[PDB]
């Protein structure tokens, strides 16, 4: 009934070009079994959406990586939000929602936009740049650690720590075990910055700690919630912005549309998130026997969702493999869906928007002018190096 496939979605060959294998996964059936890792897989939009939106049956408290916390010890203490289910999830979620609220975006937008404009001006002086190190990495590094309230010293630990976190959702392959063995100094730095005294006034970190007064979280919960933002808040946006620039570089017609109407910047970024899907995959664990897509899955089984695949499923999208900055993007699952849907999505969109706005207003052309190199991660899709020439408007 359920087809079995030998495809390894965490292999380097798969990362290098996942799209043919993703079609194979979609077309095999609504539910497949991945013999390589003994997990169920869903790669169509319909089933990915269904799983995300039934948190009771498809839980997160047994981990959203391959590892089942009921069987193995988590590599770090569980996240109070990502790796929790309702009701435990609900109050910590509400706190991060308020910390990263619509109202909060007003306090940081001017600074984020200024830094984006400044970066693009700086890059135009050089002309030929690496759109990863010099833009996709440099810009979020120039605004997010400050918005968190982090000191300057030690920030070089942030991207390695995030790479570790997202590799750790994967199976115990080489990527994962190498990350974990190098992890000690990054964990030590991050855990220390989570303490209240080390987070500057007015920043996201201080604001989380300030909520420990209200009855929503206790003081001992605040450091792990800061840890969530230091885990999920930087490397994701690096790959999202990298994705957007890569799309504009490959699809010059869309850059030209963006230049002609810079107010398309926000949707151009959203479409980039759909099109590349910086977060490719993660898991749920079944809490009961369940019927999904006409198949029966037993209790305590890992289910691997292919978010990137769902975002290219022709059953849901017209011309899924085209980058279209005026596409109706609502419903894409690049930020997830349901109760765990990215709590930081307003920050992500703000960064993406103001950077694409800067490019739209200041840059006439983006031409790849060197070898493109991919960055491999069990969960994240993105580039290591993207040599481009920027032509000023
Ligand atoms: C382009 C950038 C981003 C992408 C693609 C992205 C993607 C996602 C996805 C797919 C989830 C769902 C996980 C699940 O359902 O198990 C998620 C959750 C989460 N994200 Fe984002 N994210 C991004 C940026 C951010 C930022 C900027 C922050 C914080 C400042 C952040 C913090 C979080 C947190 C704390 C969760 C857990 C929410 C929950 O479990 O309720 N992320 N993200
Ligand atoms: O709470 C945290 O530490 C945390 C929250 C979310 C992610 C994530 C995973 C797949 S997409 C976004 C990672 C870590
Ligand atoms: Cl840690």
The domain limits of the chain are 1-393
Ligand 2 atom closest to the Cα of residue 81 is: 1
Q: Is 209 annotated as a binding residue?
A: no
| Ligand 1 in reach of 228 Cβ (< 6 A) | yes
Which residue spans within the chain are E strands per DSSP?
A: 4-5, 32-34, 39-42, 58-59, 128-130, 281-286, 290-292, 295-297, 302-306, 363-368, 373-375, 382-385, 387-392
* E strands, 106-265, in order: 128-130
Buried b (16+ CB within 10 A) or exposed e, 255-280: bebbbeebebbbbbbbbbbbbbbbbb
Cα 336 from Cα 333, distance rounded (Å): 5
Specify the ligand 2 atom closest to the Cα of 279: 11
Is any ligand 2 atom within 6 A of the Cβ of residue 232?
A: yes
**Residue 380: φ, ψ to 5°:** -95, 140
Q: Is the CB of 58 under 6 A from ligand 1?
A: no
**Nearest CA residue ID for atom 20, ligand 1:** 342
Q: Which two tokens stand for residue 70?
A: 């009921």
Q: Is 158 in the pocket of ligand 1 (CB under 6 A)?
A: no
333 conformational bin, left if phi > 0, alpha if psi -120 to 50, beta if neither = alpha
Distances (CA, A) of 29 to 198, 259, 284, 318: 50, 41, 19, 20
- Here the tokens at position 29 are 């059936």
Query: End-to-end CA distance of the chain, in Å?
Result: 57
> Which of 305, 356, 298, 314 has the alpha carbon at shortest distance from 334?
305
Helix (H) or strand (E) holding 362: helix 345-362
CA-closest candidate to residue 279, choices 338, 229, 238: 238
Q: Which two tokens stand for residue 150?
A: 């982090």
Question: CB neighbours of 272 closer than 8 A, spacing ≥ 6?
Answer: 240, 243, 244, 247, 323, 352
Ligand 3 center to residue 205 CA distance, Å?
A: 16
Q: To the nearest 5 percent, what fractions of the chain are helix, strand and coil?
A: 50, 15, 35
Q: Looking at ligand 1, which residue's alpha carbon is closest to its atom 18?
A: 342
| Six-digit token string for 287 | 């809490």
Resolution in A: 1.7
Method: X-ray
Closest ligand to 193 CA? 3
The count of other CB atoms within 10 Å of the CB of residue 207 is 22
For ligand 3, the distance from its centroid to the CA atom of residue 77, given in whole angstroms, is: 7
Q: How far is CA 305 from CA 40, 44, 268, in A?
A: 9, 9, 25
State the distance from the centre of ligand 1 to the C-alpha of 342, rounded, in angstroms.
4
State the Cα–Cα distance between residues 393 and 362, nearest whole angstrom.
Answer: 5
Which ligand is closest to the CA of 381, given by its number? 1
Q: Is the CB of 278 under 6 A from ligand 1?
A: yes
Q: Which residue, judged by its Cα, is nearest atom 12 of ligand 2?
A: 232
| 52 alpha-carbon distance from chain centroid | 15
Measured between alpha carbons, how far is 343 from 73 in angstroms, rounded to an integer?
26
Do you find a cis peptide bond into 87, omega within 30 degrees of 0? yes
Which ligand 2 atom is nearest residue 225's CA?
Answer: 1
For 1-393, CATH gives: 1.10.630.10
Compute, in angstroms, the gap from residue 95 CA to the centroid of ligand 1.
15
The region that residue 317 occupies, defined by phi over 0 for left and psi between -120 and 50 for alpha, beta otherwise, is beta
Q: Which two tokens stand for residue 19?
A: 């799209």
Q: Where are the alpha helices (DSSP H) in 12-89?
A: 12-16, 19-28, 45-52
In 3-state terms, what secondary structure has residue 55?
coil
Minimum-distance ligand 2 atom for the alpha carbon of 379? 10
Check: CB of residue 177 under 8 Å from CB of residue 386: no
CA 303, CA 297: separation in Å to the nearest integer? 9
Asked whether the CA dihedral 27, 33, 39, 40 is positive or negative, the reply is positive
231 lines ligand 2 (CB under 6 A): yes
**Strand ranges of the sheet holding 58-59, from the earlier edge strand across to the other edge:** 4-5, 32-34, 39-42, 302-306, 281-286, 58-59
């Amino acid at each position: 009934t359920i087809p079995h496939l030998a495809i390894d979605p965490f292999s380097l060959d798969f990362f290098d070009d996942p799209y043919p294998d993703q079609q194979t996964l979609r077309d095999a059936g609504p539910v497949v079994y991945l013999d390589k890792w003994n997990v169920y897989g869903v790669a169509r939009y319909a089933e990915v959406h269904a799983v995300l939106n039934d948190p009771t049956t498809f839980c997160s408290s047994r981990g959203v990586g391959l590892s089942d916390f009921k069987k193995e010890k988590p590599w770090r203490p569980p996240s109070l939000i990502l790796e929790a289910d309702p009701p435990a999830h609900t109050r910590p979620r509400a706190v991060l929602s308020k910390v990263l609220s619509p109202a909060t975006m007003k306090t940081i937008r001017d600074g984020f936009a200024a830094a984006a404009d400044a970066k693009v001006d700086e890059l135009l002086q050089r002309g030929c740049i690496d759109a990863i190190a010099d833009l996709a990495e440099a810009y979020p590094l120039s605004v997010f650690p400050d918005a968190m309230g982090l000191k300057q010293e030690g920030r070089e630990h942030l991207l390695p720590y995030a790479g570790l976190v997202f590799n750790a959702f994967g199976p115990p392959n080489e990527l994962r075990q190498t990350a974990i063995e190098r992890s000690a100094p990054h964990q030590a730095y991050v855990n220390e910055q989570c303490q209240r005294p080390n987070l500057a006034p007015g920043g996201f970190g201080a604001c989380i700690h300030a909520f420990t007064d209200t009855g929503e979280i206790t003081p001992d919960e605040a450091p792990l919630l800061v840890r969530s933002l230091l885990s999920a808040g930087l490397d994701t946006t690096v790959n999202g912005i990298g994705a957007a620039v890569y799309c504009l570089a490959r699809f010059p017609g869309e850059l030209q549309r963006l230049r002609s109407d810079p107010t398309l910047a926000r949707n151009a970024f959203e479409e980039a998130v759909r099109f590349e899907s910086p977060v490719q995959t993660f898991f749920r664990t079944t809490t009961r026997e369940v019927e999904l897509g006409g198949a029966v899955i037993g209790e305590g089984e890992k289910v691997l969702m292919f978010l990137g695949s769902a975002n290219r499923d022709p059953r849901r999208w017209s011309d899924p493999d085209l980058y279209d900055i005026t596409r109706k993007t609502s419903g894409h699952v690049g930020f997830g869906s349901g109760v765990h849907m990215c709590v930081g999505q307003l920050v992500a969109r703000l960064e993406g928007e103001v950077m694409l706005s800067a490019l739209a207003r200041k840059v006439a052309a983006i031409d790849i002018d060197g070898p493109v190199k991919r960055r491999f991660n069990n969960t994240l899709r993105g580039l290591e190096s993207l040599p481009v020439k920027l032509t000023p408007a």
